[PDB]
Scaffold this motif. Structure first.
Motif, short mmCIF file in Angstrom:
data_model
loop_
_atom_site.label_atom_id
_atom_site.label_comp_id
_atom_site.label_asym_id
_atom_site.label_seq_id
_atom_site.Cartn_x
_atom_site.Cartn_y
_atom_site.Cartn_z
N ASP B 214 33.86 36.50 50.05
CA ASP B 214 34.81 37.61 49.97
C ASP B 214 34.30 38.76 49.11
O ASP B 214 34.88 39.85 49.17
CB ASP B 214 36.15 37.11 49.44
CG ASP B 214 37.29 38.06 49.77
OD1 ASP B 214 37.78 38.04 50.92
OD2 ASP B 214 37.70 38.83 48.88
N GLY B 218 34.82 43.76 50.86
CA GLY B 218 35.07 45.10 50.36
C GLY B 218 33.96 46.09 50.66
O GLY B 218 34.20 47.17 51.21
N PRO B 219 32.72 45.76 50.29
CA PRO B 219 31.61 46.68 50.60
C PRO B 219 31.43 46.93 52.10
O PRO B 219 31.11 48.05 52.50
CB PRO B 219 30.39 45.98 49.98
CG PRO B 219 30.96 45.15 48.88
CD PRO B 219 32.28 44.66 49.40
N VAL B 221 33.80 46.72 54.52
CA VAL B 221 34.91 47.50 55.05
C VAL B 221 34.84 48.94 54.57
O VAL B 221 35.20 49.87 55.31
CB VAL B 221 36.25 46.84 54.69
CG1 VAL B 221 37.42 47.72 55.14
CG2 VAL B 221 36.35 45.47 55.33
N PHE B 222 34.37 49.17 53.34
CA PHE B 222 34.20 50.53 52.86
C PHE B 222 33.20 51.30 53.71
O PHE B 222 33.45 52.45 54.09
CB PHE B 222 33.77 50.52 51.39
CG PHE B 222 32.96 51.72 50.98
CD1 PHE B 222 33.53 52.98 50.93
CD2 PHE B 222 31.62 51.59 50.64
CE1 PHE B 222 32.79 54.08 50.55
CE2 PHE B 222 30.87 52.69 50.26
CZ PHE B 222 31.45 53.93 50.22
N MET B 227 36.24 56.26 54.23
CA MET B 227 35.86 56.43 52.83
C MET B 227 34.37 56.74 52.67
O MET B 227 33.95 57.17 51.59
CB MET B 227 36.18 55.17 52.02
CG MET B 227 37.65 54.80 51.92
SD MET B 227 37.89 53.40 50.80
CE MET B 227 37.52 54.17 49.22
N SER B 235 21.50 51.94 51.44
CA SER B 235 21.58 50.53 51.13
C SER B 235 22.46 50.34 49.90
O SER B 235 22.52 51.21 49.03
CB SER B 235 20.19 49.92 50.89
OG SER B 235 19.71 50.24 49.60
N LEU B 236 23.15 49.20 49.84
CA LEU B 236 24.06 48.92 48.72
C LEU B 236 23.85 47.48 48.26
O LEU B 236 24.18 46.53 48.98
CB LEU B 236 25.51 49.15 49.12
CG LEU B 236 26.53 48.77 48.04
CD1 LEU B 236 26.43 49.72 46.84
CD2 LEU B 236 27.95 48.75 48.59
N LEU B 237 23.32 47.32 47.05
CA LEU B 237 23.22 46.00 46.45
C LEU B 237 24.61 45.48 46.12
O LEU B 237 25.45 46.20 45.59
CB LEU B 237 22.37 46.06 45.18
CG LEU B 237 20.86 45.92 45.33
CD1 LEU B 237 20.17 46.25 44.01
CD2 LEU B 237 20.49 44.53 45.79
N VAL B 238 24.86 44.22 46.47
CA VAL B 238 26.08 43.52 46.07
C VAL B 238 25.64 42.18 45.48
O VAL B 238 25.65 41.15 46.17
CB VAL B 238 27.06 43.33 47.25
CG1 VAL B 238 28.34 42.69 46.77
CG2 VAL B 238 27.35 44.67 47.91
#
Ligand SMILES: NC(=O)c1ccc[n+]([C@@H]2O[C@H](COP(=O)([O-])OP(=O)(O)OC[C@H]3O[C@@H](n4cnc5c(N)ncnc54)[C@H](OP(=O)(O)O)[C@@H]3O)[C@@H](O)[C@H]2O)c1
Ligand SMILES: NC(=O)c1ccc[n+]([C@@H]2O[C@H](COP(=O)([O-])OP(=O)(O)OC[C@H]3O[C@@H](n4cnc5c(N)ncnc54)[C@H](OP(=O)(O)O)[C@@H]3O)[C@@H](O)[C@H]2O)c1
Ligand SMILES: NC(=O)c1ccc[n+]([C@@H]2O[C@H](COP(=O)([O-])OP(=O)(O)OC[C@H]3O[C@@H](n4cnc5c(N)ncnc54)[C@H](OP(=O)(O)O)[C@@H]3O)[C@@H](O)[C@H]2O)c1
Ligand SMILES: NC(=O)c1ccc[n+]([C@@H]2O[C@H](COP(=O)([O-])OP(=O)(O)OC[C@H]3O[C@@H](n4cnc5c(N)ncnc54)[C@H](OP(=O)(O)O)[C@@H]3O)[C@@H](O)[C@H]2O)c1
Lengths: 256, 247, 256, 247
Positions: B214, B218-219, B221-222, B227, B235-238
């Motif tokens: 989970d 969030g990342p 769906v954003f 948004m 790229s987005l590190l999570v």
């Protein structure tokens, strides 16, 4: 509802990206501290945004604090605790960009850019983080960097090291503030049409050349950054720290 | 509120990260196509998720479509238009990570890894992008890469090139699809869930905990929402700070 | 050999990486301005290296120039021109890393680190670029940054932005000084065993734990940077500008 | 000379960067193995380079080895030890770049692209790396990747993941081969010229000129030499400042 009852400090929030990011934060339920430079223009803008934020039932205050002044960090925290009870999110946005050639770059312009873009941000982040750790409820810190943190700019030998340094500060701060549940990330805006770009935008020929470089086919607006800043400050990004996020319409990857 | 009246295709959405994203997308108001490998476990997990999504008022179907079979992309796109009449978001999540040493890597395992993780994603993206363009209303594409797209792994010499390959694809396609309003991005999860080994991995995460499926919802769906309307090729590190924590 | 008939300025060349780089350029046929801070220890080391460079037929002078003093860059170029007639390569290596936690960082410690590592480098790079453009025969600039320019350190919140800003300065200077044939690059060393980190190496448990994370199985030595630094300043790097190069034994990619 | 007594294999060494790198290693004292595609022109170019290498006193052999054929790795290695009794350096340069739009990208064109650039490179690297470990005297490996390993290309959606994956391959192999004294690194060349549009492309290079094959031989011979004894898992842009000069 992404930041209900949260206190958000946005430095340099009287114009452009910071102004639209302070608006969307109040639209997400936050009480916003609208930081500005202390000039009479920035006071007119910060108090203008406050009228707009109250107009849709929000709540916000205007605080004058020159970023170059290293005291300004504690000034914003104090005025935020006193008016709203806490400090939960810091959106570090204040910065200058006086374009100038390298070989004849005056010394005082360099230090003014470094002192404002990096030095003041450091101790503004430190004063906000100190309050966040004492509360024990975690927090989020977002630094508005730039695409120029990954690439160069001939007229920006004094500017891009402060943007690259701002990104690197979030990385090291993420490790230090991690054990206290404080997330630190950076947004890298591309080419945004704002008050710095007034003279360049009126020329239609330059604007088409700038627009042609962006795969989405348009230049950025301040509202384009508001979403990713509210996202990185939210529970949607609860596992996102020490990260960067390009908001440039595909500008960086579009090698000609 | 973020994905009302949008059709989302999630490959590998029966277990792990893809399952949690598909669920969250349905909560956000989207018609979700749940994709699985076609095995018994994948079909059973896709059903159970479709049961839960339908119970809280969602809309979802379950389509089996092996990621290695380069036909699955059009199969899932046809299944999506047939049910919901649109294709607006693609979350390419399917993949395998069989750990194995390098100097004795057999050709069979490598080719299955590149075929599942990268080759199938390419034509799955191609299929979804084709429908988005012909629709003429834009769309979003999110590829679940990995923190291993930026660094290496001794037991993943066959695996990290597919992760970095997935990241490169989002960069290039964002050029070729920008004029059609189709944004392309890549999420990079860190360590997502021997107890002496489990805490040693947790010791390296500045946030002090391993990720959960989970934490990627969030990342994802954003990136698929308005948004992020100016966010493409990113790229987005999570990862809870795993990448920056040098030691 | 690689650097014949060439004058190389190396700041902070009394110890560590700078000392090894300056000695190697002299071994490649260059005339080396050995830069130091002016302390008695620094002057002794700069003189010790010059006497060694003379021992194998080389030529070098020792010049004191406090990097924290922004007037030092113009004094370094003047000493090089007066003694050797030209400035052809600049290896900016002077720097400090005083480990300290973030939330209680004194203002003096941050400003001393930024002023020495980044601000002094900017104007040492400006003064050297000014001479190179004037001569009309191109040149090379190499900034000794760090792997810390790509990742963070909880005890280096003030130090990593100066390293990330050095890399980015090289990127922006590559564009500005490109038309004049001046190549600007940055080396990113890993954990080299020097005086800047000797206290952590005084512990055997800490020294062996750090070695575990390096795929090549050993910490770096100052000479490990001399080869890469001479490569970037020579005709081998003819088409290399605005690039970075990791010299870390694989430390960066070895995800733990 | 930096490569004396070392055996070097260069794939795709009959034209462009591979040919310039193979000759430059010979001028550094290396026994070169000039790998080529086995085509008519490819064998001509590889055999003309071996006479040119012998013309100035060097030692080189020609070996046909289709990079898409995963048997080529062990063919070059066996031919190198039969001819020179050792394998000390691998310069993996062979590759193709057929520009093609994305939304109608044929399936067989993608498969040849990835198969030659990435998969064939994978097992060429493995075949050389096993011999380097068997000798136990260390080694070096250089993969000729591209600036496109960091940015996008609308007509190269199939191409950039192969180059980004070759970088990711050196990173992970650096870990897996570090203990054996095997260094693995990647060069990232820019626009290497191998006239109305040629002027505009030069205007984007701060150095003010396009690239030539010899511009890549210096970086390659450096990464292959003792001057980089502590360099592994690294990447080096050789693009005259093209990557950093935004706009
Ligand atoms: N616009 C772009 O295209 C772009 C692209 C990449 C990055 N960025 C960065 O993103 C930030 C926002 O830029 P923008 O688009 O909103 O245009 P902008 O006009 O540069 O806004 C910057 C804000 O910082 C404030 N400022 C200047 N000196 C200050 C000082 N001592 N103390 C406090 N505030 C000071 C400014 O005035 P006030 O204090 O009165 O608010 C302003 O609100 C900037 O820091 C910029 O560097 C912008
Ligand atoms: N979890 C982590 O820590 C981590 C770290 C880095 C990257 N990732 C990325 O996360 C993605 C999924 O991993 P996970 O964490 O969610 O573990 P997981 O529980 O094993 O999820 C795997 C999912 O991908 C599908 N899959 C595997 N092979 C497939 C094939 N031939 N055809 C179709 N679907 C296939 C599976 O569908 P079925 O249900 O039908 O089998 C499954 O739903 C991967 O793409 C991976 O790259 C995860
Ligand atoms: N060693 C590592 O592991 C490592 C890792 C990453 C990056 N680096 C970078 O590599 C550079 C050198 O590191 P090092 O290992 O050689 O450390 P070192 O052994 O302590 O040597 C530092 C040198 O910089 C000089 N210095 C310090 N302050 C100065 C000032 N105001 N003015 C002029 N010179 C000054 C010193 O000259 P004096 O003798 O006069 O004091 C010294 O020669 C630094 O910029 C560092 O950031 C090192
Ligand atoms: N040209 C540029 O500007 C540029 C820029 C960035 C990156 N690159 C990359 O760097 C590599 C070298 O550049 P280049 O322009 O010099 O390439 P090239 O010489 O024009 O052609 C590719 C070379 O590898 C060989 N080749 C093609 N398919 C092969 C196969 N199955 N098996 C074996 N060899 C094969 C080719 O023929 P032979 O085997 O007969 O020799 C040739 O020597 C390229 O693969 C390219 O991807 C090039």
């Amino acid at each position: 509802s992404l930041l209900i009852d949260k206190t958000v400090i946005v430095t340099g929030a009287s114009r452009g990206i910071g102004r639209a990011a302070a608006r969307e934060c109040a639209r997400q339920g936050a009480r916003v501290v609208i930081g500005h430079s202390g000039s009479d223009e920035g006071r007119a803008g910060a108090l203008s945004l406050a009228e707009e934020i109250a107009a849709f039932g929000g709540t916000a205050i205007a605080v004058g604090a020159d970023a170059a002044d290293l005291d300004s960090g504690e000034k914003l925290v104090a005025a935020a605790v006193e008016a709203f009870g806490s400090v939960d999110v810091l959106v570090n946005n204040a910065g200058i960009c006086p374009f100038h050639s390298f070989l004849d770059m005056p010394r005082e312009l360099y230090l003014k850019t470094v002192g404002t873009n990096l030095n003041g941000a450091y101790f503004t982040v430190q004063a906000a983080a100190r309050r966040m750790k004492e509360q024990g409820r975690g927090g989020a810190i977002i630094a508005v960097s730039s695409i120029s943190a990954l690439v160069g700019g001939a007229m920006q030998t004094h500017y891009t090291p402060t943007k690259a340094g701002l990104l690197s500060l979030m990385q090291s701060c993420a490790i230090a503030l991690g054990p206290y549940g404080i997330r630190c990330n950076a947004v890298l805006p591309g080419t945004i049409a704002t008050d710095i770009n007034k003279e360049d935008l009126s020329d239609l020929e330059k604007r088409e050349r700038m627009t042609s470089r962006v795969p989405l086919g348009r230049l950025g607006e301040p509202d384009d950054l508001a979403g990713p800043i509210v996202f990185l400050a939210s529970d949607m990004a609860r596992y996102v720290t020490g990260a960067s996020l390009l908001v440039d319409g595909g500008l960086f990857v579009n090698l000609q």
